Structures are given as structure tokens and as C-alpha cells.
Amino acid sequence: NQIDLNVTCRYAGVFHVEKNGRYSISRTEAADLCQAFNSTLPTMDQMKLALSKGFETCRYGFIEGNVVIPRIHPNAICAANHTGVYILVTSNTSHYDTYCFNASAPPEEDCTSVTDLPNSFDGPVTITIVNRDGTRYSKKGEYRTHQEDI
């Protein structure tokens, strides 16, 4: 009973979370997951400010109201070579990664590791936060409040 959460640097408090190495998060699960990091789904304005501080990924993830990819450098295989906050328009499917916003994070680029899941609740799952540098933090608990996500 294990969940891996790969996380990035934070940029103006915004970061990306990929669950179990695949697109696997629903919109309801994403809100609950960010809540476990004392965070919320970013607004489009919060995401645009994060982009301006250096944030880019090559993965679709939820923000409030849309599914996006923040892009700085044009790359043919990331958001069809677009720059800026690329908004997904047409898709058949509902599962993606998520972005989260922590208002207590530093204002600009914070590439230190994440070493806690401060607001997870009691539960049976071994949840492991995996940083890009490989460092890991694990705790037994749960964050999903909707039975359909479990």
C-alpha cells in the first residue's frame, strides 16, 4: 500500500506533483493532495508569476479551472512548442498530474528539497515524497477524502 509523489522546486510557491510516475490524479484527488502539502491548486495568476520566476515542466497538471503546462523554452514535444502557460483544450481523458501553491514558500526559485507532508491524516498508506535529487521523505497516512479516488 504505497504512493510515490515526485515533486519539483517551488517557484513563487508553485510546484508540480506527479503520482506513481504516470498521469493518475483526478481533479478531486488533486485538491486533496495539495491540501496535504498545506497548499491549494494555483490560480492562473499564481501560475503565471511562477512561470516568470523560472518554472517550466513538460507535463499536464491541474490548476484552478484548467489543466496546463508552464513553458519557458519552446520544445517540440512539450505543449506543441508553445511558450507561456499552455492550456489543454481538447482531451478525452480526466487524469493528469497536479500543480500546488504554498503561500509560505519563498518568493522566487526555491530548489531545496521537500522534507514533509505536513497535513496528511491518519491512514494505512506509505506515502513517499521523491525529490528530483533522489532524496526521500516517507510517512504512513492518507490524503484522499473521496472514496472514488481510492
Ligand X SMILES: Cc1cccc(C(=O)NCC(=O)O)c1
- Count the alpha carbons within 13 Å of 13 in the hemisphere toward its beta carbon: 16
Q: How far apart are CB 145 and ligand X at their closest, in Å? A: 18
Residue type, 133: D
**Cβ(10)–Cβ(134) below 8 Å:** no
Q: How far apart are CB 118 and ligand X at their closest, in Å? A: 6
Known binding residue 86? Answer is yes
Known binding residue 11? Answer is no
Known binding residue 60? Answer is yes
Backbone φ, ψ for residue 10 (5° rounding): -105, 145
Chain residues in the site for ligand X (CB under 6 A) = 10, 15, 37-39, 102, 104-105, 114, 116, 118
Q: How far apart are CB 122 and ligand X at their closest, in Å? A: 18
Geometric angle at alpha carbon 133, from 102 and 5, rounded to 5°:
50
Numbered residues of the known binding site for hyaluronan = 22, 59-60, 86
Numbered residues of the known binding site = 22, 59-60, 86
